[PDB]
Amino acid sequence: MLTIETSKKFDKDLKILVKNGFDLKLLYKVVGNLATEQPLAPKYKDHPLKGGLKDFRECHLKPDLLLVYQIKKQENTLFLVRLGSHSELF
Numbered sequence: 033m034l035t036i037e038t039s040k041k042f043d044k045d046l047k048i049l050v051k052n053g054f055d056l057k058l059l060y061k062v063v064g065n066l067a068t069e070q071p072l073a074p075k076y077k078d079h080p081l082k083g084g085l086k087d088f089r090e091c092h093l094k095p096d097l098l099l100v101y102q103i104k105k106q107e108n109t110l111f112l113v114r115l116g117s118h119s120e121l122f
């Protein structure tokens with residue numbers, strides 16, 4: 033299983049999201065699969081971030097709640113970068 037590490041911005045995003053009623057179990061389920069490198073359920077749209085010249089990817093936890101993450105295979109690490117809406121991240 034890939035090591036799972038977060039950014040300081042991600043941590044703030046989540047703290048905030050939790051305060052507004054976000055279900056952490058939604059996150060655990062998606063981050064779990066990502067880290068054991070299995071395909072996501074059809075619901076969770078997943079593609080690279082175009083505009084990220086570094087291999088950032090974008091997962092749709094909800095059609096407008098995005099998990100921006102980066103797999104760093106060289107370190108065996110899944111990096112959780114941001115969690116929020118398009119409007120909030122971009």
Ligand SMILES: [Zn+2]
Nearest residue numbers: 077079090092
């Ligand atoms: Zn998308």
Ligand SMILES: [Zn+2]
Nearest residue numbers: 081090098118
């Ligand atoms: Zn998008």
